[PDB]
């Protein structure tokens, strides 16, 4: 009874866990690029300053 | 992938602090050109009076 019920719960957090893992996969490259995009404002911007 | 998310929880972190300290991110490197833009009379014309 305990197992069939806690094999269940793993499931679900193994679940969870893939959504997570999935999620913050994208951001990190995400803010990645776009800090890489202020910077390139700043790479172009070299004229100013 | 659970120890992962953290280590891509701190790598994202970095990225978005980073990019929330320069205004959060860029305005360290503009605000100022407001400077670039008045010192053109600040300078200029303080000496284009004399001039």
Same mark, same amino acid.
């Given at each position: 009874?305990?197992?069939?019920?806690?094999?269940?719960?793993?499931?679900?957090?193994?679940?969870?866990?893939?959504?997570? *893992?999935?999620?913050?996969?994208?951001?990190?490259?995400?803010?990645?690029?776009?800090?890489?995009? *202020?910077?390139?404002?700043?790479?172009?911007?070299?004229?100013?300053? | 992938?659970?120890?992962?998310? $953290?280590?891509? $929880?701190?790598?994202?972190?970095?990225? /978005?602090?980073?990019?929330?300290?320069?205004?959060?991110?860029?305005?360290?490197?503009? !605000?100022?050109? !407001?400077?670039?833009?008045?010192?053109?009379?600040?300078?200029?014309?303080? /000496?284009?009076?004399?001039?």
């Amino acid at each position: 009874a305990l197992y069939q019920l806690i094999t269940e719960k793993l499931d679900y957090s193994l679940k969870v866990l893939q959504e997570k *893992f999935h999620e913050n996969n994208s951001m990190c490259d995400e803010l990645k690029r776009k800090e890489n995009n *202020f910077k390139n404002r700043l790479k172009q911007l070299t004229k100013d300053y | 992938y659970h120890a992962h998310n $953290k280590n891509r $929880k701190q790598e994202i972190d970095r990225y /978005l602090r980073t990019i929330s300290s320069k205004k959060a991110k860029i305005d360290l490197m503009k !605000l100022k050109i !407001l400077q670039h833009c008045k010192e053109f009379n600040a300078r200029n014309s303080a /000496l284009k009076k004399e001039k």
